[PDB]
Amino acid sequence: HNYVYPLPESTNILDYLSTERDHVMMAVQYYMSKQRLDDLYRQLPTKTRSYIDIINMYCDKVNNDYNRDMNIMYDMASTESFTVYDINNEVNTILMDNKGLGVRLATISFITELGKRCMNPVETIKMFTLLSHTICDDCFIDYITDIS
Amino acid sequence: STNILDYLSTERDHVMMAVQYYMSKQRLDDLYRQLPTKTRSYIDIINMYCDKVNNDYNRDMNIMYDMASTESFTVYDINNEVNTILMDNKGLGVRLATISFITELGKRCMNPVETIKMFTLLSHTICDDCFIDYITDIS
Amino acid sequence: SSTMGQVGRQLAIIGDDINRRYD
Amino acid sequence: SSTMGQVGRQLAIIGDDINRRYD
Ligand SMILES: [Cl-]
Ligand SMILES: [Cl-]
């Protein structure tokens, strides 16, 4: 229990569960995260839950209909190291001169995929938080509140 | 402010929340889906032990929160304190109690990034050698 | 921006197909 | 940090009680 090195300013899960420490840490972190996430959903208004239902429906469809494409894009990305700001900037440039619903649902599905592949909890939630802002531009919220 | 409804003002906030929850829900499910039998049983062990602690000491947990809520503190302030106390104290209790307390802080915190930082950082501090010894022995 | 540009065009291509099928 | 010190002692106190009740 000496000092702690501060946080910065392969995607096979089993490469992170070799030791008993890894297993128990995985259990503790999942406990904390599941507890928070259940408690969050429990408090979400009826309105937010309906937006979740909508996004569940559309993006689950994209995930299954374009599974091959999600994997392809993941490979295109992980061919070289890239930051969260890189993918965010890219997504931003597209949504600027592309006001369709599809590209936004596709982006949510893709970023979600990167989330599943990422093994760094902090960088993952950073990505989710940052990209969710970028995806939910005025064009997107208009699509969602009209389908609701 | 600690209430979720306070942050859900505009339509944009509602959609952002929905999107953020989707991503995080998808990931946490996919994660659990891939966890080996071993990890899953360790999760059950922590579920039982810490939920019992949450109940048996709900009062003390809210006391400790109000203590911490006094002044603002960073993720490192809390991690360092826990680190100091676990260095001298080697019992299972204080470790179970910390997991419960930190889990509660996470529920009150309205910043996703800072919350996961805490969980990540604290889970390392808690899962020291003696803790792992306890959990692997109660199997 | 080369590798990221590809991912970008791919998202737009998926998106266009989505806009064509669903709505 | 004084309040952080108080929180610390409580965890230990609670912890010492958990140990006693168990075992
Ligand atoms: Cl469940
Ligand atoms: Cl569920």
Residue numbers in the entry:
A (entry chain A): 46 to 54, 63 to 201
B (entry chain C): 63 to 201
C (entry chain B), D (entry chain D): 68 to 90
Anything the authors wrote about it?
The B-cell lymphoma 2 (Bcl-2) protein family is a key mediator for maintaining cell survival or to drive apoptosis, thereby removing infected, damaged or unwanted cells, and sequence, structural and functional orthologs of Bcl-2 have been found in a number of poxviruses. Here we report that despite possessing a nearly identical 3D structure and sequence, VAR F1L inhibits apoptosis via a different mechanism compared with its homolog in VV. As observed previously for VV F1L,22, 23 VAR F1L adopts a Bcl-2-like fold that forms a domain-swapped Bcl-2 with similar binding grooves that engage BH3-domain ligands.
Similarly, VAR F1L bound Bax and Bak BH3 domains weakly with KD values of 920 and 2640 nM, respectively. In the VAR F1L:Bak BH3 complex, residues V75, L78, I81, I85 protrude into four pockets in the VAR F1L-binding groove, similar to the equivalent hydrophobic residues in Bid (I86, L90, V93, M97). Superimposition of bound Bak and Bid BH3 backbones indicate that both ligands are bound in near identical manner. Overall, the VV F1L and VAR_F1L complexes with Bak appear to be near identical. Similar to endogenous mammalian pro-survival Bcl-2, VAR F1L is able to prevent both Bak- and Bax-induced yeast death, indicating that VAR F1L is able to directly engage both Bak and Bax. Unexpectedly, VAR F1L was unable to protect both wild-type and Bax−/− mouse embryonic fibroblasts (MEFs), whereas Bak−/− MEFs were efficiently protected from apoptosis in a manner similar to Bcl-2, suggesting that VAR F1L exclusively inhibits Bax-mediated apoptosis. Overall, the cellular assays mirror our peptide-binding data obtained by ITC, where the lower affinity ligand Bak is not inhibited in a cellular context. Among the other alternatively proposed mechanisms invoked to control apoptosis, VAR F1L's ability to inhibit apoptosis is most readily explained by an indirect model based on sequestration of Bax and Bak,39, 40 where Bax and Bak are held in an inactive configuration by a pro-survival Bcl-2 family member. This is supported by our observations that VAR F1L is able to bind BH3 domain peptides from Bax and Bak, albeit at modest affinity, as well as the prevention of Bax- and Bak-induced growth arrest in yeast-based assays in the absence of any other cellular apoptosis regulatory proteins.
